[PDB]
């Protein structure tokens, strides 16, 4: 579970980054306002070292796993374009610091579909996964994902008069290794 208050993209073999197409480094991507990094880091900063560990040649998951194990304060060295060619190497110190989401509800229902909602939180989440299946059933769940900016989803193709269990998972990383405690409801169509 995140406590530095920013996201990263990039890494060798990763999904790339929105700043520099041909650079496989690690880049600060979104920064939580009023979070630990808010005065110090900005989108597009390339992380080259953290607590003495090189982030050159590192894979995405390796970077995430390293950053997550660091205790308390994290010293980062980043490269920032200022930037007509011009570059700065900046050393900063960032001090780390239920379910996600909360208040899962059905807003509207038809005999074969449900519109669900949950509380919008626009930071800390890479994407949501929504699962649904017959309550107590043994078949694999059906599922889909929605972006971090969503606080509603429509579930379609349901059987009328059947009990369903609906669960929402909020993943902090894009590769789906960490989710927060999920939230579920039961609903009968």
């Amino acid at each position: 579970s995140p406590e530095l208050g920013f996201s990263i993209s990039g890494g060798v073999g990763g999904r790339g980054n929105p700043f520099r197409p041909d650079d496989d480094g690690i880049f600060v991507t979104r920064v939580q306002p009023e979070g630990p990094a808010s005065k110090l880091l900005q989108p597009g900063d390339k992380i080259i070292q953290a607590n003495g560990y090189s982030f050159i040649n590192i894979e995405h998951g390796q970077a995430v796993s390293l950053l997550k194990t660091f205790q308390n304060t994290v010293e980062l060295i980043i490269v920032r374009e200022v930037g007509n060619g011009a570059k700065q190497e900046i050393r900063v110190r960032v001090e780390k610091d239920s379910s996600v989401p909360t208040n899962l509800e059905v807003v509207a229902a038809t005999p074969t579909s449900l519109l669900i909602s949950w509380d919008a939180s626009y930071y800390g989440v890479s994407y949501y996964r929504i699962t649904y299946g017959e309550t107590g059933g043994n078949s694999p769940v059906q599922e889909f994902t929605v972006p971090y900016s969503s606080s509603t989803a429509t579930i379609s193709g349901l059987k009328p008069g059947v009990d369903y269990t609906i669960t929402v998972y909020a993943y902090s990383d894009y590769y789906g290794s960490h989710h927060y405690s999920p939230i579920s409801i039961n609903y009968r169509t």
Binding site: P2, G16, Y123
Partner: peptide, 8 residues
């Protein structure tokens, strides 16, 4: 699109 970032 699918995300390309992870929170730390």
């Amino acid at each position: 699109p699918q995300p390309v970032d992870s929170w730390v």
